[PDB]
Design a binder for this molecule. Structure first.
Ligand SMILES: CN1CCCN(C)C(=O)COc2cc(ccc2O[C@@H]2C=COCC2)Nc2ncnc3[nH]cc(c23)C1
Length: 351
């Protein structure tokens, strides 16, 4: 059988086909703009379960995958015991122009799970455990001169996403509750070391911090801002910054978090966003009316008054500090009293 690609350069994959005379395709896990993810059995390692990322046969995607493979090699060198909750590669190969990267098989990503639960949020204890793991994982990368730059719910995966179906106490509907909240962080293709070239713009827009929008440069604090956004999303089930454009995004930041510090305004070359030292925007436009209607102070989004909710919000506020130098580090975040609520099994990583 010939090797066939579709019109977008995706490999046409057939259940039963082998790659590298080794990986037997047994399931299709999903398709994205990069290519697809397929479930395989690895016949050279006792029919172990693999997720294979199969990249489009398109030069720019091939080049990007080669960069991801090289980042993944460096990460493994620093974490040989695979203790820091990252998804590391077990193999890679170029299959007729398609870069393929083999990973451990995991469950649903945390976005897909949320979507399959009709966007009903994760309970606070789940949020807390997921937060703890994220802070742990990224602290390790940060201490090794690495920044992820593209953290978002779809890049964070449950180890096993099996769930219980419960009747929602307070709503007229069912709810899916994950049985084990162990997660792993993936997708390191944009991850950048301190000594390497930093592009002006990084991150997916909804998780992108103000220093990037204002072109002030970025480093590890970029990831902490993303984490703040992620945790909000886990806790409410909707995006903190449901935005498509920079000026709008800044206005949303001001409505939710308070004024942008004047020292950042004075430094930015993006003066098009300001007039007389304040954000300038059209309150009567579609975007202006949307933000005025929908964007409220961060504390207004708390679902309950109790101590653990108050502490989550204190931590989130600190992750969402405008000034990246003032923003909480992950090392400090791990000392936050929010994490007093973890079970011993959660805290010691015996989930
Ligand atoms: C390689 N894996 C990251 C790739 C890049 N990335 C984050 C995504 O593509 C996100 O979306 C999926 C991830 C996925 C499998 C299916 C996905 O597709 C969605 C599913 C339903 O509707 C379509 C959208 N990953 C995985 N699954 C299981 N085991 C895995 N091990 C490692 C990964 C992974 C990361």
């Amino acid at each position: 059988r010939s090797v066939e690609d579709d019109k977008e350069g995706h490999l046409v994959c057939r259940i039963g086909d082998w790659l590298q005379e080794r990986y037997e395709i047994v399931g299709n896990l999903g398709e994205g703009t990069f290519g697809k993810v397929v479930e395989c059995l690895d016949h050279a390692r006792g029919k172990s379960q693999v997720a294979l990322k199969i990249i489009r046969n398109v030069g720019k995607y091939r080049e990007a995958a080669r960069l991801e493979i090289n980042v993944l090699k460096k990460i493994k060198e620093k974490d040989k015991e695979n203790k820091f909750l990252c998804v590391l590669m077990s193999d890679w190969f170029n299959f007729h122009g398609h870069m393929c990267i083999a990973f451990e098989l995991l469950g649903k990503n945390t976005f897909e799970f949320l979507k399959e639960n009709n966007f009903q949020p994760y309970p606070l204890p789940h949020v807390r455990h997921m937060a703890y793991q994220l802070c742990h994982a990224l602290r390790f990368l940060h201490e090794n001169q690495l920044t992820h730059t593209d953290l978002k719910p779809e890049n964070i995966l449950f180890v096993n996403s099996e769930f219980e179906t419960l009747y929602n106490e307070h709503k007229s509907c069912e709810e899916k509750s994950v049985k084990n909240t162990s997660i792993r962080v993936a997708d390191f293709g944009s991850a950048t070391f301190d000594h390497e070239h930093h592009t002006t713009i990084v991150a997916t827009r909804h998780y992108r911090p103000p220093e990037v929008i204002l072109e002030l440069g970025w480093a590890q604090p970029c990831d902490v801002w993303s984490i703040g956004c992620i945790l909000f999303e886990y806790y409410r089930g909707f995006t903190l910054f449901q935005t498509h454009e920079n000026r709008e995004h800044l206005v949303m930041m001001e409505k939710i978090l308070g004024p942008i510090p004047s020292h950042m305004i004075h430094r930015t070359r993006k003066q098009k966003y300001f007039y007389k030292g304040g954000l300038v925007w059209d309150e009567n436009s579609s975007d202006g009316r949307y933000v005025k209607e929908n964007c409220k102070p961060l504390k207004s989004y708390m679902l309950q008054d109790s101590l653990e909710h108050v502490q989550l919000f204190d931590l989130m506020r600190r992750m969402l500090e405008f000034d990246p130098a003032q923003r909480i580090t992950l090392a400090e975040a791990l000392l936050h009293p929010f994490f007093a609520g973890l079970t011993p099994e959660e805290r010691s990583f015996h989930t």
